Amino acid sequence: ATVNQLVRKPRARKVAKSNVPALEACPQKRGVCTRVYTTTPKKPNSALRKVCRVRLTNGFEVTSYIGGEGHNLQEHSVILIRGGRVKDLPGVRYHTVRGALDCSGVKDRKQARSKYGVKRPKA
Amino acid sequence: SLSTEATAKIVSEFGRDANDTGSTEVQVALLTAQINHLQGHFAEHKKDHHSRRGLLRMVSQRRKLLDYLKRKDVARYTRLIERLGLRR
Amino acid sequence: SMQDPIADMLTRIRNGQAANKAAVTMPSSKLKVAIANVLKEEGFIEDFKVEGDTKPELELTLKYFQGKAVVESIQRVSRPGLRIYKRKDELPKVMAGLGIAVVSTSKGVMTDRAARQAGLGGEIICYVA
RNA sequence: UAGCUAGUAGGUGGGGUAACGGCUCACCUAGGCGACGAUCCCUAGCUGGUCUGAGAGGAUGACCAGCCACACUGGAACUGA
RNA sequence: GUAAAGCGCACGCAGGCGGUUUGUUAAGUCAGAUGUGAAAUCCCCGGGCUCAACCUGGGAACUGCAUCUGAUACUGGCAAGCUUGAGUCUCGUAGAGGGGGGUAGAAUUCCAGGUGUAGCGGUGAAAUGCGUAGAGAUCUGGAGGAAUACCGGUGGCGAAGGCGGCCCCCUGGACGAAGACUGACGCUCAGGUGCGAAAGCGUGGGGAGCAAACAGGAUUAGAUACCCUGGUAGUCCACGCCGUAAACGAUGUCGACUUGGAGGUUGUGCCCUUGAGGCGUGGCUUCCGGAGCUAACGCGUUAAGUCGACCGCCUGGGGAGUAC
RNA sequence: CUUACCACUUUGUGAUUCAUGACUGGGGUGAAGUCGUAACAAGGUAACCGUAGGGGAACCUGCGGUUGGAUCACCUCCUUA
RNA sequence: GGGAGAAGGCACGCUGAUAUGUAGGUGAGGUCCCUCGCGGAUGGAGCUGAAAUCAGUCGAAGAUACCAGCUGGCUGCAACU
């Protein structure tokens, strides 16, 4: 572009936006679950993945993933959520922090323990 | 373009006694006499667009040589404009 | 219209140099002569004359070290509009000082190496390499 | 978001400040500002600095320090340097 | 260029840039100076706390602003020039450049009349149609309206879209050959105003051919289509309106520079012009190809090479050239 | 007490922006739904662009435009030809 | 062109001053010109005289009576007089 032309209407760096709407641009948020859904994934995978719909404190309502191999979660329970885009599930951009609030952790992991929320077994 | 015998008359009257061709006043007088001739042509020939392009070339050109003349001798320019009857 | 004629002067020299011509001719002006004088003194070009002084032309003769162009490449920097100016200490080193910048200072058109010994900044015309 | 503005714009003279000044007035007179983006809306205390980056640049204004602004909300004056 | 990306094309104000010479001023420009750029947080050299973080002394930094002093190479200002740039004059040349009027032939059609008999027309084949009320074919005469064979060619002209009978009238642009004249009047261009293939469009005329829509026939499993028989708007003129395009070279303008070959085409210098021939120079134009460039194809002196100036434009796909 | 300016308050009118609504236009997306192929092979009528017309829909059709189409790709051999 | 008098709101008496009645219109004698008197210049008597601002003042109310449009939103029909 001409230097005179760039004087007249300057370069504008590419328009910025987040891949996590809601939260509040901060790493955690609480919400109460409104519904829990078992749901299927998009096409090369076949599984039955576990999801909750959660109403965040801020009054956005978002669909959040429930990691790990067991969950005790029920509708109308308070859980803490953290960003994370689940590639398979339509519209799921957030995860539940298993060891926080009434989410109650994953019993019996012995390896990736502090993901999820498992106390040291030998303490 | 303007008639050869008329052209001899134009150069004679708006040039000096050296009988210039290129002098700025003389070019403007020649354009003007052609614009006035053509302005009679585009009375009847309303929809002639390709000759109108040549008209806008003469008018634009004169307009440039008038800028030149006013940057040089303002006495000569103020004189020329009224002697050829330009504007209001 | 030929908007910068010193830009043209250098470009004849590059195209000259590329096509293995002995000599390159163009209209002259005092600045062109002064530039050729630095190039001549720094050895990029053998000689020049100014001739047809009723309506000038400058012709200069190129050098080929051994089957390969003496200039590696030459570019204009103080192009119209942009007009880059350098302070005495800023003064740019072209190609680890193996090139030259041709620098219009108030003590004349000169090479950077000598401009630096002089302690005098100015307008940076073109760099050679 | 392309027109905005008549105490606005200029002058004259009176009142007013600690002081210059439509600061305010009453004559006057018609301008001023504006695509070098006025006006209108959205967002924001500002800076030295901090982060980042080879640099240019980009993001930012925790803390330390300087200035501004606020003091339950809107408004006013007093006393006093 | 084809990946997203050049405005459809022009003129042109504000704006950006400005051949060449001298003088001069010294704005930008650079060099020096002084005041300021608060403090620690940065940086280098020190010091202390057992090391470090940390605290800390001195320098440098804070690239800037400011005024005084200087320099004149550059660019700006200003004054006077110069002439290659750009403009201008006479003489000529080529062409479907534009606009307005007239006119001629061939042909499809229609009406009129003569002859003349049973199919004609159509396709892959067919049917609908037209025909025994005399068609088709064929001879004569008239009517009308559009187009304007061959010539026509990679041709030519045009800002682009575009323009082909012939004749006159008005008029634009280019190019040459020599002489002369003005003397930077230049280049580019946001906003802007201007110029349309096409179908569309308003009002008025016109309607011969073609022909969307529409109909009938056929093929098809359908078949709103292909093919066939008809046929309206339209196309054509006059004047006015939104300015769309694969509006192209998918390539923005102007200018400089950089090995050629073979051809078109038009001015033009020299030749017992003596082989549709030889030498010289400009203008446009086209196929080929070298250096170089490009991812590649490919471009290549008419660049997509080497660069200059100014403008447009692009920033993953869909959504969307859509919504508001 | 009094006139002066002045907050709150009031009443009329519009703009903007967020929420929101019977309902409906168009878009996205779904581990072999219905109907027909439209494009890609000159894709079985060359494709595409523009604007009018029509249709269930891909689309067809008139008009003008391009190659971003490409098939034994004609011409003076005539004596071989 | 309109809708539009959209809607909505403020002001309004009397008296004094600016001016013992202003601006404005009227144009006497008076003075001068000349084809020379139903004449022109002419100066400005008396006459008439709008509206404003500024001050004051009275009542519950100053278009005081009479005489002066009820407004706006959605929508059927028919261009309209």
Curated annotation (Swiss-Prot), chain A:
Keywords per UniProt:
Acetylation, Antibiotic resistance, Methylation, Ribonucleoprotein, Ribosomal protein, RNA-binding, rRNA-binding, tRNA-binding
The source's superkingdom equals Bacteria
Q: Name one GO cellular component term.
A: cytosol
**Key word tRNA-binding present:** yes
Instruction: Write down a Pfam family by its short name.
Output: Ribosom_S12_S23
Q: What Gene3D superfamilies does this protein map onto?
A: Nucleic acid-binding proteins
Q: Which SUPFAM superfamilies match?
A: Nucleic acid-binding proteins
Location of N6-acetyllysine modifications: K107
The reply to whether Transmembrane helix figures as a keyword in the UniProt entry is no
Quaternary state and partners of this protein? Part of the 30S ribosomal subunit. Contacts proteins S8 and S17. Interacts with ArfA. May interact with IF1 in the 30S initiation complex.
Q: Misc remark for this entry?
A: At least 19 substitutions or deletions in 11 codons can promote streptomycin resistance, dependence or pseudodependence; all but one of the streptomycin resistant mutations (K42R) are associated with hyperaccurate translation and thus reduced translational efficiency.
Task: Report what the protein is called.
Answer: Small ribosomal subunit protein uS12
The record lists the organism as Escherichia coli (strain K12)
Swiss-Prot record, chain B:
Native species of this protein? Escherichia coli O157:H7
PROSITE patterns attached to this UniProt entry: RIBOSOMAL_S15
- This chain's protein is named Small ribosomal subunit protein uS15
One of the entry's Gene Ontology molecular-function terms is:
structural constituent of ribosome
In terms of HAMAP family, this protein maps to: Ribosomal_uS15_B
Sorted UniProt keywords: Ribonucleoprotein, Ribosomal protein, RNA-binding, rRNA-binding
Q: State what this protein does.
A: One of the primary rRNA binding proteins, it binds directly to 16S rRNA where it helps nucleate assembly of the platform of the 30S subunit by binding and bridging several RNA helices of the 16S rRNA.
Family note: Belongs to the universal ribosomal protein uS15 family.
Cystine bridges: none
Instruction: Read off the SUPFAM superfamilies from this record.
Output: S15/NS1 RNA-binding domain
InterPro entries per the UniProt record, alphabetical = Ribosomal_uS15 (IPR000589), Ribosomal_uS15_bac-type (IPR005290), uS15_NS1_RNA-bd_sf (IPR009068)
Give yes or no: UniProt keyword Repeat: no
Q: Name one GO cellular component term.
A: cytosolic small ribosomal subunit
Superkingdom, according to UniProt? Bacteria
Example GO biological process term?
translation
Q: How does it assemble?
A: Part of the 30S ribosomal subunit. Forms a bridge to the 50S subunit in the 70S ribosome, contacting the 23S rRNA.
A Pfam family (short name) is Ribosomal_S15
From Swiss-Prot, chain C:
This protein's source sits in the domain of life called Bacteria
The residue range of the signal peptide is none
One GO biological-process annotation of the entry reads: ribosomal small subunit assembly
Q: Which InterPro entries match?
A: Ribosomal_uS8, Ribosomal_uS8_CS, Ribosomal_uS8_sf
Q: Which Pfam families match?
A: Ribosomal_S8
**An annotated GO cellular component:** cytosolic small ribosomal subunit
Q: Which key words tag this protein in UniProt? A: Repressor, Ribonucleoprotein, Ribosomal protein, RNA-binding, rRNA-binding, Translation regulation
One Gene Ontology term of the molecular function aspect:
rRNA binding
Give the quaternary structure: Part of the 30S ribosomal subunit. Contacts proteins S5 and S12.
Name the protein family: Belongs to the universal ribosomal protein uS8 family.
Q: What does this protein do?
A: One of the primary rRNA binding proteins, it binds directly to 16S rRNA central domain where it helps coordinate assembly of the platform of the 30S subunit.
- Its recorded name reads Small ribosomal subunit protein uS8
Could you tell me which species this protein originates from?
Escherichia coli (strain K12)
Instruction: Name the gene.
Output: rpsH
